[PDB]
Amino acid sequence: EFDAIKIALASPDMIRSWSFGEVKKPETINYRTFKPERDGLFCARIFGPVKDYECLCGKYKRLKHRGVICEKCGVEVTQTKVRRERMGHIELASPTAHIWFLKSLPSRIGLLLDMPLRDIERVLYFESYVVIEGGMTNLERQQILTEEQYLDALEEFGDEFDAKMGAEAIQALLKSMDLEQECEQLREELNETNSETKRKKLTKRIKLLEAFVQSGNKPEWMILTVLPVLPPDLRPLVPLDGGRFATSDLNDLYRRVINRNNRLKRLLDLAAPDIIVRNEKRMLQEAVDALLDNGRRGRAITGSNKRPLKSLADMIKGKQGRFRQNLLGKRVDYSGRSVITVGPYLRLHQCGLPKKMALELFKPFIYGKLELRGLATTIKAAKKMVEREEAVVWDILDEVIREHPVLLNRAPTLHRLGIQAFEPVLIEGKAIQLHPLVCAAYNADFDGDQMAVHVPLTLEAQLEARALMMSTNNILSPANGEPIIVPSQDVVLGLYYMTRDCVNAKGEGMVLTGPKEAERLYRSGLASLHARVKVRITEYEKDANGELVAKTSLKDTTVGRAILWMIVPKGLPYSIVNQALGKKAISKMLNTCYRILGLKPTVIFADQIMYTGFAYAARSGASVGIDDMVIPEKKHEIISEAEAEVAEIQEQFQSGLVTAGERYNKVIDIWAAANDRVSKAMMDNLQTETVINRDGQEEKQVSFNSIYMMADSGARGSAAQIRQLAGMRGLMAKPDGSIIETPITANFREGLNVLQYFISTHGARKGLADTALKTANSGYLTRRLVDVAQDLVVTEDDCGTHEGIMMTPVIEGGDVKEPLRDRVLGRVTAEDVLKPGTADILVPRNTLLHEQWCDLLEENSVDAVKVRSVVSCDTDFGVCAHCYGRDLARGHIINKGEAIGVIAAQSIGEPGTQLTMRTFHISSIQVKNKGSIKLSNVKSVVNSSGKLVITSRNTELKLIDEFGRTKESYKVPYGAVLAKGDGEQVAGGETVANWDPHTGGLPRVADLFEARRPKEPAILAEISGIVSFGKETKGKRRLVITPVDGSDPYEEMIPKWRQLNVFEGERVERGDVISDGPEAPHDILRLRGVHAVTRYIVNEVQDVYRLQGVKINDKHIEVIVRQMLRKATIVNAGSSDFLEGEQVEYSRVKIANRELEANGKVGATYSRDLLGITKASLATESFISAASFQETTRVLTEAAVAGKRDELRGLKENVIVGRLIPAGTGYAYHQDRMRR
């Protein structure tokens, strides 16, 4: 069909070209025969027939009369559907301004003619006249004159001096000027005088008019001469129940427009005075503006309805306009939903589907199959058969359902695993049965949550569901390689109770041939589930060529682990089932199974795991009772000591000895200490409570108490909840946030009184509100993140860039918080690989660092690894497959075509739910491991005592062990004491150095991503060299820079009334701390560079997320950052046609000036620009996406005045237009077309 879409200003001729007739009446229907009154808003002559292929009069009534024009009613006979397509027009008596170009924030009409907005509005209201085409007179072609000036003005020159008032004047201003003339002069003006204002108005206006003229749209078209009307069936008057009618308020607005225009024409024909006709012109302007966009004016009230009326821009823009509610998202046929249930008997790749839902859903396929097999004469008979629900059709539904997958989705869709494909299993009832292992991926509780189902109709959809969206194909999370099918609660418990050892049970220490003997022993009740035993077991090892070998041995284990070994697939070692099998390890089991044996076994392994977990958790008989909760008798003794201390401190504070705040803080500290004491007492009482006897008097073990097992296994709970079921429960705060002066001394095992519950209610309300509102804020963040970076795909495999980033184990000034193996795994190297002394090249520049190579680097232990990144990619308008990496649910490299930016945004979005909108309340270096001191970037001096003291602020301290790696890094302040220096060796825990040391949880990410600066920013010097101070005290005390080999014309104006940190007689590098406080990322890029700012952003967001314990790979934030910096401002035009201060996207100027650099002509210099996500989202060429997102009005007006053409590359706009995505399967197809 068609290609790229164009948008521009509408010529009145073009408006009439769309239009077939002019509406001349405000009437809609005849009021008795609801036929349309010709010719009005609803008209058959202008628009079309009310009924299919019928004249309004009925003379040419037959259906054979196609294309004939009637002559008694002037109606053309066609389908009534064309009553929704055909347009009309209205000829305005007086010219009218288009409010979209008037009230756009950069007013198009106002900025075009170099005129302020207030003056234009004062002119449109007939408050003041305005000159046009004065020739040789006193005033220029544009000026403002009051009525008492216009009085004696025309008396000076009756001719050669034209001066009108109103919209006709603005149209004469737009038509009189031809922009070539006013551009040629702006050239010289902007050439000579510097005057930042001059260049700003220049760049804006000159770009406006040059891109303006390039298209061909004329300025006069900002003034509306003709007005196009919407087809009637788009704003219908369809009758409703009870004789009442329903209509869009558009009809009322068009009605007012027609009425007032006709009244203005009548007043013109009646020779009305100037006051009345000016009032009518203003009123007509008001009506037209209310029609176009209601809200920038008096906000016309409805008729008998107090709310305003929905205008056209109101139909388009907003979260409920045709963009958010229709084009991006739409209601779908062949779909349903219901409450969900468990269905544990299911294998992983299926779900329980009710009979009635599957019947109503697959109706067309049922009809087709029934009439294909001859069981139904025709399609009507098939519908009658299913409406009767005959017994034969159930087998036909069996046939059509077998190999036809269905799609399941939950309401809070965060990541792609929010939708998954399953195989239908017909189930009696009305509830959907969802496999339990997938619930973790869905975040779907069984607390009433409902899920929806969809049916893939076409063959391509079925194959995409089976090969991509299948539950079996998606086991590893995309955000991190961790599995998403991990057993959740009951199965984890079952396996924990199975695999475990008590000190004594039936048949401890006996011997068995293998696991089958263990099953025979247990099921007959002769041997206990947990008992220390030795059994012969056969484990398998792929060995020495890939050929499978097997070895048997006598292993020390328990009966439960022996029985469990039967499920373990061939290749795994027995060591994996010899531990206690916590949830954390029940995950690593499946992880290793997938890494070794592949997907095919791992699936059946997980199925059998869930089966046996549920079975043995049932068999165990686990429960929870009132006595299962421990209550240490020491509890009251600790309470008593605490309250004796509080009466002591009340004695001391009463007799004016300890101050108020100090005593309060001390009470807080002692209460926290007492809470910790009670917690430790109850935990030691409960954890190893079990005192038992085995061939001897007494021994003790890990307790078999129910709630303790539920806590330790990871099935349900953590330390805090168990602490609160048993011991005194912490301390809360008042609405101010001030912590209470008397912590709760009760547990839920006991009975709380009124005060304690009333105080806990505060925190309960705070936290529940945080959840309820933070979830919506997080969804908002997810939307911004998808919009900024979604148009990114794997366009080409490689680009050839050698740029990359250095990777080291992250250390924040303490111990390592994340190893280098987590940060480098799954990424392609960016350089040659050598040992510290260049022994030989271990790894090349393009080997994907998979597990083998990660381990090999672990052997050599070099920890400065240059790796390829997404931001450094040379690819234009896309990403190369090598620089991305390999990460996916699948373990191989990324495929040529997968849409990675959307996955990145979803990966960041899923942890957004786990965050919190409002936070809960809130001497020297001590080395942890043994190593060697390495002082880096430090000036040192030997003091009187001989201890090395530090005279620099940027001092860093590394711990180099005997291999050469760096595990400990710290930042040492200026003026510290070092008993050591650079070169010696220290012990573990040895104090190396000493010195005297002297509010939003989740939006801490949003403010960071938006590139928003801190409230009080720090400053960074511009260039390296020695610094000093200068001119005195007027708002700013100047900072003089000093470079080494040249002078510094640079001189910064830093306000003196803020404390500085830079040493007035010391050297400072470009980007060194001249003061303190948080910093703004744009300046961080502007000084340090690209890699520094992307490293800052990824590290900061990784800290914020890691605090809540969510694993996220750096790649997604890498691609977000690459899309953030996409824009850059030109600096020197050179031999290019760019503007000196123009902001263009990096890739475009890149390819252009790179071709000019391959040419002989000099290139153009640029400077990278940092745009926030909600701002870089606007810097998207194809405006359709920009209007789907950010405010639609101004976006359309800008792209329209520019005459911007749109070839619809990328995804979102293809989604709008409704054809194939250029990312997934379609990419191949699209790769066939874009090359064509």
Binding site: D445, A720, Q721, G767, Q914, Q1108
Partner: peptide, 21 residues
Amino acid sequence: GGAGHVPEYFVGIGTPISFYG
């Protein structure tokens, strides 16, 4: 405590924060 569906208002300062069911 854990299994994040509602936050734990009651804790010693510095703990990450639950995120409790």
